[PDB]
Design a binder for this molecule. Structure first.
Ligand SMILES: *[C@@H]1O[C@H](CO)[C@@H](O[C@@H]2O[C@H](CO)[C@@H](O)[C@H](O[C@@H]3O[C@H](CO)[C@@H](O)[C@H](O)[C@@H]3O)[C@H]2NC(C)=O)[C@H](O)[C@H]1NC(C)=O
Ligand SMILES: [Ca+2]
Lengths: 45, 71
């Protein structure tokens, strides 16, 4: 299995968890970035 | 408007200027692939040279031997 500090693509490829939310769809799947929280701008804006 | 006239051997017009292509676009590839790192919407995708396949579905390493860059 993948390491503690390594995110997992559901195809069985383990990638460093830094790449999550880095802004590019790193897996062969898109699930490197799917489910990332959007950048917070400001309340009421 | 007519710019200029040349021989009917002319095959193409191409504008040679810095702003023709956005030179500052960031290369998304992360030095993962053993051979080709092609682009795709919002990222990249590794590929093997023609005829060679990925080893045991590694999807980064191919059976092809790597070749030195040409300068
Ligand atoms: C040529 O491409 C460059 C990128 O290499 C363009 O610069 C960036 O364009 C994006 C998209 O329009 C902008 O968001 C960037 O501005 C900044 O982006 C960050 C997010 O990364 C925001 O937080 C900032 O508030 C700001 O909006 C812009 N800057 C860079 C270098 O990222 C450029 O527009 C483009 N130019 C031409 C001539 O096509
Ligand atoms: Ca990413």
């Amino acid at each position: 299995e993948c390491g503690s500090g390594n995110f997992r693509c559901d195809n069985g490829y383990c990638i460093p968890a830094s790449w999550r939310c880095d802004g590019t769809r790193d897996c062969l799947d898109d699930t490197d970035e799917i489910g990332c929280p959007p950048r917070s701008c400001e309340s009421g804006l | 408007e007519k710019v200029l006239v040349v021989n009917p051997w002319l095959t193409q017009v191409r504008i040679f200027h810095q702003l023709r292509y956005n030179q500052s676009v960031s290369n998304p590839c992360k030095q993962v692939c053993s051979h080709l790192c092609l682009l795709r919407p919002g990222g990249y995708s590794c590929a093997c040279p023609q005829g060679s396949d990925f080893v045991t579905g590694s999807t980064v390493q191919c059976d092809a031997a790597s070749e030195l860059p040409v300068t």
